[PDB]
Amino acid sequence: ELQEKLIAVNRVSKTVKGGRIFSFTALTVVGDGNGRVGFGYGKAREVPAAIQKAMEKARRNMINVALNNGTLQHPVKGVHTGSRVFMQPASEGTGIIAGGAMRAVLEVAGVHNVLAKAYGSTNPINVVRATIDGLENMNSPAMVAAKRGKSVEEIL
C-alpha cells in the first residue's frame, strides 16, 4: 500500500560570488509490495522539502516487476553506469541478503527472498537505478511462453 523509504540524503554545494550555496538531495524509493517499485531523486534547500519532492517523483514513474511467489524470477544482472549489480532468487526463509540501497529497493518492491551483491561503484543513486533496471527487465515464464510461441508447460 505504497511503502516508501528514503535511502540516502546528501548535501551538495554550489559556489557563487558570495560564497557557497548548500542544498540537499534525497533519494527515496516507494513501492506497493506486489511488484511495483519506483525511485525518486528530489533536491531542495532543506531536507524535508527535498524528501517531499523525491517522494512525489518516486510515486510517479513507477514500474511493474514480474515476481514469482515473493522472489525473483531468475538470476538477473543489471548495470547503470558504475553500478553493476547481481541478484539471485533464493529459497523461502532466506530473507533479503542485499546491501543498503539495494535492500531498500528490493523490500519496497516486495521481494521477500533474494541474494544480492552490488559490484562496481556502490553510489546509492546509481545502484538503485541499476537494481530497478534489472528488476524491470526480468521476465516471467508466461512472458517467455508468449515470446517463443509455446505453452508455459512446454517450457517449464
Next chain:
RNA sequence: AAAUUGAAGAGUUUGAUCAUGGCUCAGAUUGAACGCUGGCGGCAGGCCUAACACAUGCAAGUCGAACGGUAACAGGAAGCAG
C-alpha cells in the same frame, strides 16, 4: 526420509559531482602474548624461539618348563650339643 538454505556494506581525494584507485573499518579464527581483573566445574590444549648445553631420578626386560649351578633367602632333612 535427510546430508550445499547460498553471496550486505561503510568511512576517506572534491567547493560540490560522477568515475578510477588505494588506505582503513565492521566478521570469523589462534599452540597465541601483554595490560586490568578473576568464584566453580566439565572436555581439550600447553617450547611456535636454541636440531642450544644438560645436574638428578626413571623410560627394556624377561624365561629355572633350554643349561651348568647356589651368592642369598625360606624351609625341611642327616649330624648333632642345652
